[PDB]
A paper describes a structure:
3D helical reconstruction yielded a map with a global resolution of 3.14 Å where a single C2 symmetrical dimer of AlbA (AlbA2) and a single C2 symmetrical dimer of AlbB (AlbB2) form a heterotetramer representing the biologically relevant asymmetric unit of the filament. The AlbAB filament lacked rotational symmetry along the long axis, instead exhibiting repeating units of AlbA2 and AlbB2 with a helical rise of 46 Å per AlbA2 and AlbB2, a helical twist of 120°, a helical pitch of 138 Å, and an overall diameter of 100 Å. Masked local refinement containing one AlbA2 and two surrounding AlbB2 units yielded an improved 2.78 Å map allowing confident model building for the dimers AlbA2 and AlbB2 as well as the bound FMN cofactors. The AlbA monomer consists of five α helices and four anti-parallel β strands. AlbB forms a dimeric 8-helix bundle with each monomer containing four α helices arranged in an anti-parallel orientation similar to four-helix bundle proteins. The AlbB dimer is formed through extensive intermolecular interactions of 35 residues contained within helices α1, α2, and α4 in a knobs-into-holes packing scheme often found in four-helix bundle or coiled-coil proteins. The most significant inter-dimer interactions occur between helix α3 of AlbA and helices α1 and α2 of AlbB. The positively charged AlbA residues R24, R28, and R175 are highly conserved and coordinate the phosphate group of the FMN ribityl chain.
We show that AlbAB is a megadalton heterooligomeric enzyme filament containing covalently bound flavin mononucleotide cofactors. We highlight that AlbAB filaments consist of alternating dimers of AlbA and AlbB and that enzyme activity is crucially dependent on filament formation.
Residue numbers in the entry:
A (entry chain C), D (entry chain D): 8 to 105
B (entry chain B), C (entry chain A): 13 to 192
Write the structure that this text describes.
């Protein structure tokens, strides 16, 4: 594995571990964004090394808008997550290994 | 030799660590034949089942099932067939639709017992994304997925769980008589 | 000798004709111990069970259970304990309340398997008057009866049922592939 | 990127997205294990391609024991997460890219 790639996975592991611990001292609607930000970082890892085809990018760009929006906005998190799950499901066959 | 039923029934434990060694098709067919002998309401058999085992499909279904730990040999998905349960008023539909699921759970239990008697392991998983698997597997609209169960060979030794004493959950002839 | 599990799992049939010969207490306790090994969601064990066997109480419960045929040796009533499933919004309550019943059905299946391996018979019955048995047995309000199962020695020979072929209810890797 | 590696990152993204949505219909102490299982899968991704040196493995093996333990056990999740964060912090300099 390339040294930069190796670091990126490990630093992703620290974020998930740190977020999990810091969920004991934060509100109840916070594991939603930690997982949403975790999915954002995994897909951001792909296109930084040339692994996003055409729709793996369109989800990371929509994940960006939801994550970087100003706080306090009344967003239906259930509806957008359902749509993103549907989009990402349609993109897996393009990268399927036989 | 084939195990005596009473030792097997007590020993079954949820297995979440599975080994890479795959399960051959004859064993899968025999387990599926053993699991269809469950009771069904009025002999209606209002259920559907699916077997996923291709190495790519098992890992794609695993992602959309966060409650599943470890990568099993194959997946069995149990559903309730709603086509054979609608009648007259919606009250009767609810009455014959809850009972339909109560009988589907028994088939899953039979499957786990059969797959444990053979030296494998399994655990029913209910926390999964229903719509996504329905779209992925091509399941029609009148068939509702209920439980996703992985089956495979345990990777580590089995470890029993901790359960409340018999007195706490069982009463004789009246509520509160945990002695008779 | 104790039966091999695979022959026992296929042979279990619903028994509705029971003989007058009673079942001794040690066997009842052993069957109850075998039936508590079922899986439960998150190890919560949100269930309650009751054993009725006094000759008068079994016949009084039988009347209020029209789906029960024949007079068994004893009755086991399986309920879901709702005290340990309420939390936050009612949506989570429904989510953790359906799953609670899905695990209670497995215990009934285990009980029938254990009582068939011993030479007895049984059949789950869902058509019963819920409120009347709750009042008669003193069951509190937070405990909801689900299934009433009779257990006893079969009076006549066992006769299997007629079931749809494996192809009809089982599909491989896609909806419609009843071959692979 | 190797095709198997590309699939593994994307399937990790689906798990985080699916867990985030399914956190709206599950108890409040569930984002703890989703993040702990997320950190387990990221480190499991490293040693499957030869990227775990000596302590990146000792955390994924301790993460395994915590995750695969029978449910209902009274475990002090704060203490173990603090220890794992401390161990993982000591292992980052070994894989640091200059
Ligand atoms: C699963 C189930 C089976 C029932 C139920 C309810 C449920 C949830 N209720 C029954 C009832 O009220 N009366 C009755 O006679 N049987 C009931 N059953 C069992 C079912 O009818 C039989 O088991 C089935 O029809 C025969 O199959 P078999 O192979 O066991 O003979
Ligand atoms: C009955 C049931 C058990 C489940 C379910 C759902 C139902 C309806 N869902 C589970 C899940 O999503 N993840 C998981 O890990 N287990 C699930 N289980 C089983 C249950 O958690 C275990 O079987 C139990 O906690 C341990 O008991 P054991 O004696 O078998 O080890």
């Amino acid at each position: 594995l390339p040294p930069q790639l190796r670091e990126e996975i490990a630093l992703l592991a620290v974020y998930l571990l740190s977020s999990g611990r810091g969920l004991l001292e934060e509100p109840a609607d916070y594991g939603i964004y930690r997982c949403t930000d975790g999915a954002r970082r995994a897909l951001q890892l792909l296109d930084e090394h040339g692994g996003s085809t055409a729709r793996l990018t369109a989800v990371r760009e929509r994940l960006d808008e939801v994550m970087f929006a100003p706080m306090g906005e009344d967003r239906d998190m259930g509806a957008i997550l359902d749509d993103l799950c549907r989009q990402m499901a349609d993109a897996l066959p393009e990268i399927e290994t036989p | 030799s084939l195990p005596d039923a009473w030792t097997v029934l007590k020993t079954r434990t949820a297995v979440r660590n599975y080994a890479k060694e795959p399960v051959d098709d004859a064993l899968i067919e025999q387990l599926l034949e053993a699991m269809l002998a469950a009771p069904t309401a009025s002999n209606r058999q209002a259920w559907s089942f699916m077997v996923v085992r291709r190495p790519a499909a098992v890992r794609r279904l695993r992602a959309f099932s966060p409650g599943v730990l470890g990568t099993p040999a194959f997946f069995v998905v149990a559903c309730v067939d709603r086509s054979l349960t609608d009648n007259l008023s919606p009250k009767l539909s609810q009455k014959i639709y809850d009972t339909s699921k109560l009988c589907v759970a028994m088939a899953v239990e039979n499957l786990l017992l059969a797959a444990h008697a053979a030296g494998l392991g399994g655990c029913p998983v209910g926390s999964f994304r229903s719509d996504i698997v329905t779209s992925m597997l091509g399941i029609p609209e009148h068939i509702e997925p209920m439980l996703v169960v992985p089956i495979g060979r345990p990777a580590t030794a089995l470890v029993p769980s901790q359960r409340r004493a018999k007195n706490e959950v069982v009463n004789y002839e009246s509520w509160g008589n945990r002695a008779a």
